[PDB]
C-alpha cells in the first residue's frame, strides 16, 4: 500500500499519491482536489473541510481555521498575540501553550494547534483511503521553508495524532521543485524562484539545485497577504453597492458579510478564466435578495496595489540570494492565487517575458511533490537507469 504526500496548508490542504507511474491529486467526496483547513464543532458533530467551511456563517465562534499560524508557538509569542485579534474563535493559555477553545456537544472543549491540524490530516488521510480502497499510514507532509524545529516537530506530532507515520517533513517550495522534476537535472547548479501566493500567505523562495541537492538561498514574502485579501477588496465594493441601492448597511451583520465573502471568492475564481462573473445571494440582509455582476477589470483595479506589491519580495529575495533576475533558471507558480492572469502577467513582465512553470495546477504542486517524495522514501520509485 502506497505512501501519500500531504500539503497541510494555512487555508487549504491537498493530498496526492504516486501509483502506476503517475501522481494522482486526489479529489475528496465532494469532488474537490483541495480541501479547506477548517474544523467546525457543533451540537451534534465535528465537521472537517468543505462541510466545515460551508457553515462558517451560522457557526463562527466554533469553527476553527488558521491553526497553522499557532502550531509550534508559545502563547506569549508576539505573532500569536497579534494574530488573535483576527479570529472569531477563542485562544487560551495552557501553561505557556496556546489552545483553541470551542463549544462542542454542549460542552466547553479546548485543543492544541497540533490536535486541530491532526483533524485536517485525518480528513486528508480518509480522502486518500477512499480513492485507494485501503488504509494509509505513511506520509510525507510539507511545511514553509521558514518553519523552525518547534513548528516542524509540532507538524510531525499532528501526523502522529492523525494515525500517520511521517516519513519526512519537507519544505513547500522544495516540494514544488520536485513536482517539476527540477532535482533530476545534472551539470552546473541552477537557480529556482518559487512564487507562492496562497489563501493567507505569500512566499518567495530562491533555491539552488545541483545534482539533486537543495539549498534554500533566501526567503521573502508576507505572512498576511493572500487570496482572502482579494476577497475582502470585493466585499467592501459590494457593501457599498448594497447600501446605495437599498438604504441599508450590512457591515455590522456578521452573517451577511460572511455570506457575501463566500460569493466573492467564487466570483474571483471565475474571473481567472472569464472576463466577468455574476453573484446571486438569496435574502442577504433583512429580506433583500442581492444580485450583481463584476468584471475582471474591476476586480484587478480593486486589488491593484496588492498585486504589483508582490514584486517587492521578489526583489528582496533576489538581493538576499545575491542574484540578478537574469540568473534565475526556472520560475515556478505555486498557490491558488497564482491562477490570477494579472499576477502571472506582472511576474512574467518583471522577468522580461521569460516563460513561467505553471503546467501543474499551482494549488496542487506542493502535494504533487510530496507524493513523489513519499514514493521515493518508501522504496516505491527506484531509478534503475537504462
Amino acid at each position: 500500500g502506497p505512501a501519500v504526500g500531504i500539503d497541510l496548508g494555512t487555508t487549504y490542504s491537498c493530498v496526492g499519491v504516486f501509483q502506476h507511474g503517475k501522481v494522482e491529486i486526489i479529489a475528496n467526496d465532494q469532488g474537490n482536489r483541495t480541501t479547506p483547513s477548517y474544523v467546525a464543532f457543533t451540537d451534534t458533530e465535528r465537521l472537517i473541510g468543505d462541510a466545515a467551511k460551508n457553515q462558517v456563517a451560522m457557526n463562527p465562534t466554533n469553527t476553527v481555521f488558521d491553526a497553522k499560524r499557532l502550531i509550534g508557538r508559545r502563547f506569549d509569542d508576539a505573532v500569536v498575540q497579534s494574530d488573535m485579534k483576527h479570529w472569531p474563535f477563542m485562544v487560551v493559555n495552557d501553561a505557556g501553550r496556546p489552545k483553541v477553545q470551542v463549544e462542542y456537544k454542549g460542552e466547553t472543549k479546548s485543543f492544541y494547534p497540533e490536535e486541530v491540524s491532526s483533524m485536517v490530516l485525518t480528513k486528508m488521510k480518509e480522502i486518500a483511503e477512499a480513492y485507494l480502497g485501503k488504509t494509509v499510514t505513511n506520509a510525507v507532509v510539507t511545511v514553509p521553508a521558514y518553519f523552525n524545529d518547534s513548528q516542524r516537530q509540532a507538524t510531525k506530532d499532528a501526523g502522529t495524532i492523525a494515525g500517520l507515520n511521517v516519513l519526512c517533513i519537507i519544505n513547500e517550495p522544495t516540494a514544488a521543485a520536485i513536482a517539476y522534476g527540477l532535482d533530476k537535472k545534472v551539470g552546473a547548479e541552477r537557480n529556482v524562484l518559487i512564487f507562492d501566493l496562497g489563501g493567507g500567505t505569500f512566499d518567495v523562495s530562491i533555491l539552488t539545485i545541483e545534482d539533486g541537492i537543495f539549498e534554500v538561498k533566501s526567503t521573502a514574502g508576507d505572512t498576511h497577504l493572500g487570496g482572502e485579501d482579494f476577497d475582502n477588496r470585493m466585499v467592501n465594493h459590494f457593501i457599498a453597492e448594497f447600501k446605495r441601492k437599498h438604504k441599508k448597511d450590512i457591515s455590522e451583520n456578521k452573517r451577511a458579510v460572511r455570506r457575501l465573502r463566500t460569493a466573492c471568492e467564487r466570483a474571483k475564481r471565475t474571473l481567472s478564466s472569464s472576463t466577468q462573473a455574476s453573484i446571486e445571494i438569496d435574502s442577504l440582509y433583512e429580506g433583500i435578495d442581492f444580485y450583481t455582476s463584476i468584471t475582471r477589470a474591476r476586480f484587478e483595479e480593486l486589488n491593484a496595489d496588492l498585486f504589483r506589491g508582490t514584486l517587492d519580495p521578489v526583489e528582496k529575495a533576489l538581493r538576499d540570494a545575491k542574484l540578478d533576475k537574469s540568473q534565475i533558471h526556472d520560475i515556478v507558480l505555486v498557490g491558488g492565487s497564482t491562477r490570477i492572469p494579472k499576477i502571472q502577467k506582472l511576474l512574467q513582465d518583471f522577468f522580461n517575458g521569460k516563460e513561467l512553470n505553471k503546467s501543474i495546477n499551482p494549488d496542487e504542486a506542493v502535494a504533487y511533490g510530496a507524493a513523489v517524495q513519499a514514493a521515493i522514501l518508501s522504496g516505491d520509485k527506484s531509478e534503475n537507469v537504462q
Binding site: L167, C168, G212, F214, I376, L377, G379, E383
Partner: protein, 92 residues
C-alpha cells in the same frame, strides 16, 4: 569523487546480494558515521535476521535524516541500493 566511486564499486561488487551489502556497509559509510556496528554474516543467516539488519541500515542512510549533510549524496546512493536489494530478496 572518491567517496562516490567507492560506493559505485561496492554496489557493482555485491550484485544486489542483500547479505553481501549489509555485511560490508561499514566500508562505504562516511567518516563521522558512528551508529552503524559492522555486521558479520553469522548475524545474517535467516530471513528474520536479514529483515532486522536491513531496517537498521536504512535508518542510518535515510535521505530524510541526511538532508543538508555533507554525506547526503552518499546516503541516498546506499539507501536506493539497499531498497533494491531488499525487494529482490523479498521476490525469492
Amino acid at each position: 569523487d572518491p567517496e562516490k566511486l567507492k560506493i559505485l564499486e561496492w554496489i557493482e561488487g555485491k550484485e544486489r546480494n542483500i547479505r553481501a551489502l549489509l555485511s560490508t556497509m561499514h566500508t562505504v559509510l562516511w567518516a563521522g558515521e558512528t551508529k552503524w556496528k559492522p555486521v558479520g554474516m553469522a548475524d545474517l543467516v535467516t530471513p528474520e535476521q536479514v529483515k532486522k539488519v536491513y531496517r537498521k541500515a536504512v535508518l542510518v542512510v535515510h535521505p530524510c535524516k541526511a538532508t543538508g549533510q555533507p554525506y547526503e549524496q552518499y546516503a541516498k546512493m546506499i539507501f536506493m541500493e539497499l531498497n533494491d536489494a531488499w525487494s529482490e530478496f523479498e521476490n525469492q
